[PDB]
Amino acid sequence: EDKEDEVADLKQDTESLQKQLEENQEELEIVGNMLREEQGKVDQLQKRNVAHQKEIGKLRAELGTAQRNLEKADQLLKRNSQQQNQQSLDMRKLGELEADLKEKDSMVESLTETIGILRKELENEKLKAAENMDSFEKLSMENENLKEKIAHYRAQRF
Amino acid sequence: EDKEDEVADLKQDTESLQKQLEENQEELEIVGNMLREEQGKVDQLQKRNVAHQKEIGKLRAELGTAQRNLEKADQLLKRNSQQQNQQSLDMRKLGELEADLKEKDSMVESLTETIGILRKELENEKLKAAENMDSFEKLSMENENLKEKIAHYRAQRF
Questions:
Q1: How far apart are CA A118 and CA A112, in angstroms?
Q2: DSSP readout, B28-61?
Q3: Residue of A11, A13, A15, A48 for testing the chain B interface, max B β-carbons within 10 Å
Q4: I need a surface site. Which of A143, B11, B42, B120 has the fewest CB within 10 A?
Q5: How many domains, in total, are found in chain B?
């Protein structure tokens, strides 16, 4: 209480405490924004995150249908044992047939060769037959001349 | 009476102020945390997204091949099928052969018919020519016999 006591020390000091206030209010704005945007990002990332939830969804159906379908149409390629087994069943039935028929064809060829001979031996014995019965007539003829000549002797013939 | 009630007034001006810088730092305390907590949420979502996106590329290839396979094994169903074209022609045209067997079958049975007959007719032409050989010998034996009777008669000239 003597002329001057704590003059501006109180006056120019509230400005201190007042200016610090000037900041915490500014900065609180800066952080206020960053927050608005960082939570802004999460809006966009959170979205994309399901856009992928979807894309990845589809693929679980497609790689499934296509992997079990490779089995669905693979049982049909398992019939390659019934289809190639016939290469044993059929190559034999056709293989043995081309052999047992080509052969039975030589028979008919060997047989008709003999039917050809029997047709000839029975051809000649048809000739030697007529031919021999011929030598008989000449003899049958001469036979008579003799019966006569002898008949005359038993009587006539001076 | 005023120098005493002066610094008393600046107090209030500082009471109200010190409160603000305090109550305010509480807003800045929280709001600062809210921000970081979001940046936490962001950075990470930024990850699962790169996780999915990368792993969406894997399923993309697993689907790719798994499809080429469904087709690579399907060309093979076009070949397994066309062998049904040649296997059918083999099961139907092989039958013509087992059928062309009965043609030669009836032939070798039909020829042994004509071979059996000629062999039997050859036997009769032989039985016949066996008589003629006999009735001829009788004859020859008769003339030979007569010439002799005759030659005895000729014994009347001497």
A1: 10
A2: HHHHHHHHHHHHHHHHHHHHHHHHHHHHHHHHHH
A3: A48
A4: B120
A5: 1
Ordered DSSP codes for A70-117: HHHTTSSTTTTTTSSTHHHHHHHHHHHHHHHHHHHHHHHHHHHHHHHH
Task: Quote the tokens at residue A116.
Answer: 């050809």
Domain that holds residue A102: 1-158
Nearest-angstrom CA–CA distance, B147 and A27: 177
Domain harbouring B147, CATH code: 6.10.140.2140
Count chain A–chain B contacts defined by CB atoms under 8 A.
207
Question: Which has the closest alpha carbon to B60: A158, A56, A2, A7?
Answer: A56
Taking the CA of residue B18 and the nearest CA in chain A, the distance in Å comes to 7
With an 8 Å Cβ cutoff, are A74 and B73 in contact? Answer: yes
Query: Which of B1, B74, B14, B107 has its CA nearest to residue A16?
Result: B14
Taking an 8 Å cut-off on Cβ atoms, the answer to whether B129 and A128 are in contact is yes
Experiment type: X-ray
Work out the angle at residue A84's Cα, subtended by the Cα atoms of residues A80 and A86, and round it to the nearest 5 degrees: 130
Residues in chain B: 158
Distance CA A136, CA B138 (A): 11
DSSP 3-state assignment of A5? Answer: coil
A7, A12, A125, B4, B5 from B9: Cα distances, Å: 13, 14, 173, 10, 7
CB contact under 8 A, A125 and B125: yes
Which chain B residues are Cβ-neighbours of A39 within 8 angstroms? 38, 41
What distance in Å separates residue B102's CA from the closest CA in chain A? 9
Pairwise CA distance, residues B12 & B152, whole Å: 208
Chain A residues in contact with B14 (beta carbon < 8 A): 10, 13-14, 17
